[PDB]
Amino acid sequence: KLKVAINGFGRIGRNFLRCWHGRKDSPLDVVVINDTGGVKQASHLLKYDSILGTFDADVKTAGDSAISVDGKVIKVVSDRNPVNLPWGDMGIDLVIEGTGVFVDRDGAGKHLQAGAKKVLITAPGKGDIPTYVVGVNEEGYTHADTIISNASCTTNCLAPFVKVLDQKFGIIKGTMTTTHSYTGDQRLLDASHRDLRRARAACLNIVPTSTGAAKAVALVLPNLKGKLNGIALRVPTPNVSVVDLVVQVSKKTFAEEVNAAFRESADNELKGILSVCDEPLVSIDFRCTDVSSTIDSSLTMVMGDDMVKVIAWYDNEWGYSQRVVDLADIVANKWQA
Amino acid sequence: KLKVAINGFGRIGRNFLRCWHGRKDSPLDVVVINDTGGVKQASHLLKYDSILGTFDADVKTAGDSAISVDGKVIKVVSDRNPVNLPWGDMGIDLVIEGTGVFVDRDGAGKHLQAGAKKVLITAPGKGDIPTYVVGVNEEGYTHADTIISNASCTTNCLAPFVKVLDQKFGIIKGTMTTTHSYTGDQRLLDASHRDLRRARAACLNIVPTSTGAAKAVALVLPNLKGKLNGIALRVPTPNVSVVDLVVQVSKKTFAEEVNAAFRESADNELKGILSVCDEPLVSIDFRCTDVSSTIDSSLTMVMGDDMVKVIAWYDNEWGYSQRVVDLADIVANKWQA
Amino acid sequence: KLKVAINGFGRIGRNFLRCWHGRKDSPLDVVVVNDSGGVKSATHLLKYDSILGTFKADVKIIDNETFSIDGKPIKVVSNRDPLKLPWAELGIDIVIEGTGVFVDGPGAGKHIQAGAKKVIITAPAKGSDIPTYVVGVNEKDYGHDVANIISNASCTTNCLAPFVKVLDEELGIVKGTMTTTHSYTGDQRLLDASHRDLRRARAAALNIVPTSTGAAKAVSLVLPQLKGKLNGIALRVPTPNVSVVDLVVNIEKVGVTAEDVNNAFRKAAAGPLKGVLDVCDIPLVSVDFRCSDFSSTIDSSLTMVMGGDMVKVVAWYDNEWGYSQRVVDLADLVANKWP
Amino acid sequence: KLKVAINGFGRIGRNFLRCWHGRKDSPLDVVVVNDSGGVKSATHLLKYDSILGTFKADVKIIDNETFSIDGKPIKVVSNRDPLKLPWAELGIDIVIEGTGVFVDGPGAGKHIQAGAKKVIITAPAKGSDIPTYVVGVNEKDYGHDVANIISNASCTTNCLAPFVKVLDEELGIVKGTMTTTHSYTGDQRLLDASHRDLRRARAAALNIVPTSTGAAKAVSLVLPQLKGKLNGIALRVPTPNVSVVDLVVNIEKVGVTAEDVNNAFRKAAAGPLKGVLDVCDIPLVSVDFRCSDFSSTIDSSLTMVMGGDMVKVVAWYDNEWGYSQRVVDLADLVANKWP
Numbered sequence A, B: 001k002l003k004v005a006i007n008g009f010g011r012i013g014r015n016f017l018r019c020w021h022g023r024k025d026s027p028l029d030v031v032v033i034n035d036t037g038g039v040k041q042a043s044h045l046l047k048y049d050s051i052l053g054t055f056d057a058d059v060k061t062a063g064d065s066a067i068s069v070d071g072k073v074i075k076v077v078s079d080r081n082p083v084n085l086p087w088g089d090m091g092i093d094l095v096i097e098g099t100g101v102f103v104d105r106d107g108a109g110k111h112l113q114a115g116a117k118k119v120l121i122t123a124p125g126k127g128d129i130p131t132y133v134v135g136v137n138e139e140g141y142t143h144a145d146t147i148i149s150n151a152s153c154t155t156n157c158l159a160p161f162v163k164v165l166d167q168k169f170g171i172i173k174g175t176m177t178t179t180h181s182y183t184g185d186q187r188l189l190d191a192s193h194r195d196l197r198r199a200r201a202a203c204l205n206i207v208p209t210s211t212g213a214a215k216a217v218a219l220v221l222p223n224l225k226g227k228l229n230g231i232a233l234r235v236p237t238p239n240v241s242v243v244d245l246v247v248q249v250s251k252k253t254f255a256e257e258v259n260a261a262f263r264e265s266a267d268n269e270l271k272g273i274l275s276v277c278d279e280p281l282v283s284i285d286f287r288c289t290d291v292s293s294t295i296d297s298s299l300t301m302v303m304g305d306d307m308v309k310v311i312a313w314y315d316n317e318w319g320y321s322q323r324v325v326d327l328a329d330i331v332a333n334k335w336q337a
Numbered sequence C, D: 001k002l003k004v005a006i007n008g009f010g011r012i013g014r015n016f017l018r019c020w021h022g023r024k025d026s027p028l029d030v031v032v033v034n035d036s037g038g039v040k041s042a043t044h045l046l047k048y049d050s051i052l053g054t055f056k057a058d059v060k061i062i063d064n065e066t067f068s069i070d071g072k073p074i075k076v077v078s079n080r081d082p083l084k085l086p087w088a089e090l091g092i093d094i095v096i097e098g099t100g101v102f103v104d105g106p107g108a109g110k111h112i113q114a115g116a117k118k119v120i121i122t123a124p125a126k127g128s129d130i131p132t133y134v135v136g137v138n139e140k141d142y143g144h145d146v147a148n149i150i151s152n153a154s155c156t157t158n159c160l161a162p163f164v165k166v167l168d169e170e171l172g173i174v175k176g177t178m179t180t181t182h183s184y185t186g187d188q189r190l191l192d193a194s195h196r197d198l199r200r201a202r203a204a205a206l207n208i209v210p211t212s213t214g215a216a217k218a219v220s221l222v223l224p225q226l227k228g229k230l231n232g233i234a235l236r237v238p239t240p241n242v243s244v245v246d247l248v249v250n251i252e253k254v255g256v257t258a259e260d261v262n263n264a265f266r267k268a269a270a271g272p273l274k275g276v277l278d279v280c281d282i283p284l285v286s287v288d289f290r291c292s293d294f295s296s297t298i299d300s301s302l303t304m305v306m307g308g309d310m311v312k313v314v315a316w317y318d319n320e321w322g323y324s325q326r327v328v329d330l331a332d333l334v335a336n337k338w339p
């Protein structure tokens, strides 16, 4: 019922499209794809993925400006400047901004100009923009918002179970460190970058880089403003990452009580978002996981009764996409104009 | 002067031998090497290292039971059961137990039987054994101890700067997580293991495994008994690891004050052991680093005035070896009869 | 119908079981595994695989020695000495020897002594004992009563043979060399440590590692006509799975062109080798061949004849899955040619 | 004695500067770099390198555009358009064009227009107007007045040419194919993303990636006699540096044996190619060739003649360091043959 446009057919662009194809009766409907790459490029990479593996569906290069997916046809355009994209001409109701450049009022806006109605930024918003984390405050949304960000891959993980903690033990303060797979942003070989760390090897190092997810939590959980903050470590893995939260709560608590709380929420309210896992697994064992966050129960540990540490896995690509879709899935509902 | 025997010419065995060759006027003197491998094996791998790179020295296979290093000749034997090794016959005063099996009273002892006088275990000791971490309590040593452990690669890092913290801000409690390079212990491909995590891919995952360095700290810093505890993450890198400590101190403090303290100690007492680094670097940038621990200043951050997080790099192979040598370097001094 | 045992629950053995499960209706029936680790270590690794990904099906631990894949039980024992195995007690008809240790007549046969009917080695024999088969090539040559110990050759040899045949059988192979950029394997060290082969003793994950390979010579074992004409090395590269062969044989025939050499494959591909050979014209990369049922896939755009006589081919093959899939076909044979 | 500029401060350019620093007493004198990142981004990466390791020497940031390697200053500018470069102002005599963009006459020449005397491209020229040299092979062919724009060929071609010569020049090369298991490079994607070559667009780090390469043909550019006789592909494997070539040319001569083919190298190695070629008999692996000054190293134990006429060789070469070292020799030449 809701016409969608994917701008920035990159990792989240494709991880999304596919995430979508798997949903049943989706209020969303992709019709146009805009990426610097030609129809060839869009086809190939939607079909052959080095992380999600070959796509189970018939994907051919139907057209000079389109591609086919199981028959459903989609147009592929390519303008490095949004304003030009025929969003208005095609009556684009929603745009999934996954390019990594248009993250600000000014930028994301060029989509509105092109005739688009709304712009969902597949990343944290820069400046004054509505940030929502499905499961943490999607009710805050209102069809009034023309530009929203679905936060970061990290925040979307850390948030859900932080809510659970604070909302039960009261987070006083706490740091966190996310051992994260690398991303398109890193340099494959020591090359220039504005982050001399991210500028390094990527596949040969543990690259400490900074992350906003720290303060971004507060963005969606107003209560924790200035109580959280952490860094991140980019390790040699193409996907799936883990967060190492460490909060100090008021209400003295113990190991299994914490985990318990998590499970409870994971079975009720956060069912579909959060989840626990006792089976001692590892990164790779968490590919294609529809949930945003997954607690590694056996790792959770408490100190001096009030210092809680929680490890949590999450597929920074898929799981996020599934959220992106779930958010857009929402915009389609509670949509009046 | 002090005759030494390297048992377990593995990574720490060799990283040690070489660490030694670089020292000037070393009270130590290697004379025999025992490893399941033949003279060929000992030669090659001492010369061609995939992590330390080709060894700068002339290394030939002189003998049927020996190898030559710049002329200094060394015997290479091979008995999977220590008791047999001719430690007594060669008047072995010290044995560097780096095999990973003989970590207990019973085991390490077989060396004593073979005629050896002392046994330095290049790992944490299992059970009741003297554990010393050069820079954290080497004065506790006395020629009386026949079997000592130079703790783990992690503990040897985490300890030095923990002492600095407690001894200045008072550690109340705190967890830690060590993003660690992989080791011989992990399986190259999903294969059986007593730790179904360590049993996984190794090079394709972030493998959560447990570490003793958590409680082991207390071993050498009696004061922190039961105040520290953490896990570890085995990421795809052959060497150099980082620890993410998170302690809550009593004396309210701030970012740069902490770092300062570190530097002060690093310039005085811990000179040679601890050290700070402001230049934003990455893993690989810390190979062959003679120090046990290196604080990444720009990363250190405090919360609510009492929750301190400190990141610290360390070459789990080289830096440790240099410690092992420094410990054995000590046994040679303060050695009576 | 036919009871099967799997001695060696590692990669190839587990890749086997997997291959077998999701199948048409194999006459085979795995009823026991010999993983020196118990039901725990044996289950976990069947469910969660770093290279194949979480196994799609309810795998639970019944008994203290009997897990189950979707209800169907599988008894699991453990002992390094086949002689102590309950093959007879259970009445094992076929044994998939996938350990890489028992590869000689005396050894692999220890399974017969235990009470096994027939033994299939998932690797090249340990000597001149036992035949070597390569589905697609000379599988017919196998008939009951003819040796109760066979070898499904090598992962490489099972990738080469097939398209090596079509080359000689329709162009005449004078002789040639070959190389194989191969995904590292369990026999390699994770980090530089003692190993009988100073090449495999180097960090499997951070080196291109040259190591001899008979896979080349052994082609003859199935294609006699070539006996002593092929040969080559192998290069281990930081890639957990899926490898490629680089064959360079200067042909006997005329001096045909590139794209026609291909056509031969393409022809013999959808024909006699429908399920074994195949040609992929679309430019992909290793990772795109994960879980490939074809024993060999030629990169069309890579083939190229040089001096009219010298032909060069490049093939893609998943060393884990592919081989394991043939190993299930070769065990599927045994059963279709059974009293 | 001669002022040198370095346009493009990445791997090869930085590998250059390093090569040059710790040297006998090169007539060359780097006085300026063009890294689109300032003194910061240009310093840091010269000091800390993931593949060469922390640079051994005091590297400080003087001025806002003038770092210094042990006191010796180096002015640093930045602009994508060579035309705006102060080559004339500074009086630049040689320019090491290592960007991989300006590789045609019109382009690389933009440096002359800015005020440059001579330009050396660290890659193959796209024109036909420009001479391709390969120290060890045909360096003599270069003399002042003869073109002010030269190309030091390819990393691969500079590893092949040398020992390819000795092969033909002392055995006669009929013709042959070749492959090269090559360490991934900057032109590859880190993760599957848009790229004009759907092979390079795949995760450089997790795939064996087949990609065309002229390095084969270009051999002729220095060894005419072979023109149109060699050829081959290339395979990218998860290894940041150091690669190997797999040459398979069926010789013209008799049908010599293995170990003698070698001896030719060994002979020509400590003789005319002392500094370029070399033969390592000790079985090592890629990582053991890091920082190798030889443009090519043959793995003795790997060489092997098949049918008397077909010879197969394997060579080791550090693509970053090696090439960069030659590029400093080729720039060393220009100066030794300067008025």
Ligand SMILES: NC(=O)c1ccc[n+]([C@@H]2O[C@H](COP(=O)([O-])OP(=O)(O)OC[C@H]3O[C@@H](n4cnc5c(N)ncnc54)[C@H](O)[C@@H]3O)[C@@H](O)[C@H]2O)c1
Pocket: A007, A008, A009, A010, A011, A012, A013, A034, A035, A036, A037, A079, A080, A081, A082, A098, A099, A100, A101, A122, A123, A151, A152, A153, A183, A184, A185, A316, A317, A320, D193, D194
């Ligand atoms: N993958 C993750 O872990 C993850 C998850 C959450 C957030 N994010 C953020 O989302 C953003 C999207 O990046 P990605 O993960 O999709 O990877 P990516 O970098 O491959 O995606 C960017 C894509 O957009 C295209 N593009 C850039 N500018 C364009 C323009 N003007 N018009 C059209 N196409 C254009 C690029 O060619 C590229 O294909 C990044 O900023 C990333 O940090 C990433």
Ligand SMILES: NC(=O)c1ccc[n+]([C@@H]2O[C@H](COP(=O)([O-])OP(=O)(O)OC[C@H]3O[C@@H](n4cnc5c(N)ncnc54)[C@H](O)[C@@H]3O)[C@@H](O)[C@H]2O)c1
Pocket: B007, B008, B009, B010, B011, B012, B013, B034, B035, B036, B037, B079, B080, B081, B082, B097, B098, B099, B100, B101, B122, B123, B124, B151, B152, B153, B183, B184, B185, B316, B317, B320, C192, C193, C194
């Ligand atoms: N590398 C590190 O990060 C590190 C640092 C601190 C602690 N350690 C300790 O170092 C020790 C050695 O492990 P490693 O890292 O060198 O790996 P490794 O596996 O390469 O070293 C073990 C070596 O011991 C040899 N060995 C085994 N049993 C033997 C026996 N009976 N007699 C003689 N030699 C025998 C093996 O052949 C092997 O070469 C272990 O105790 C480990 O806990 C490792």
Ligand SMILES: NC(=O)c1ccc[n+]([C@@H]2O[C@H](COP(=O)([O-])OP(=O)(O)OC[C@H]3O[C@@H](n4cnc5c(N)ncnc54)[C@H](O)[C@@H]3O)[C@@H](O)[C@H]2O)c1
Pocket: B190, B191, B192, C007, C008, C009, C010, C011, C012, C013, C015, C034, C035, C036, C079, C080, C081, C082, C098, C099, C100, C101, C122, C123, C154, C155, C185, C186, C319, C320, C323
């Ligand atoms: N997976 C592949 O890539 C591949 C390719 C083709 C063929 N193969 C062949 O498969 C064979 C097995 O190697 P792998 O890769 O499966 O290694 P692996 O180590 O993963 O498997 C070995 C298995 O055999 C068991 N085992 C070992 N010794 C035993 C003994 N004495 N008695 C009983 N069980 C024993 C081990 O417990 C383990 O379960 C090798 O010969 C290999 O060449 C493997």
Ligand SMILES: NC(=O)c1ccc[n+]([C@@H]2O[C@H](COP(=O)([O-])OP(=O)(O)OC[C@H]3O[C@@H](n4cnc5c(N)ncnc54)[C@H](O)[C@@H]3O)[C@@H](O)[C@H]2O)c1
Pocket: A190, A191, A192, D007, D008, D009, D010, D011, D012, D013, D015, D034, D035, D036, D079, D080, D081, D098, D099, D100, D101, D122, D123, D154, D155, D185, D186, D319, D320, D321, D323
């Ligand atoms: N070191 C190697 O791996 C290697 C091997 C042999 C040859 N080469 C060749 O050297 C060339 C350089 O590529 P690289 O591998 O060093 O990659 P790189 O990206 O590390 O180096 C390119 C450098 O040129 C600069 N640059 C790019 N466009 C520019 C422009 N228009 N104006 C000014 N500066 C510009 C970049 O900022 C960067 O500093 C390539 O053609 C490559 O094939 C590299």
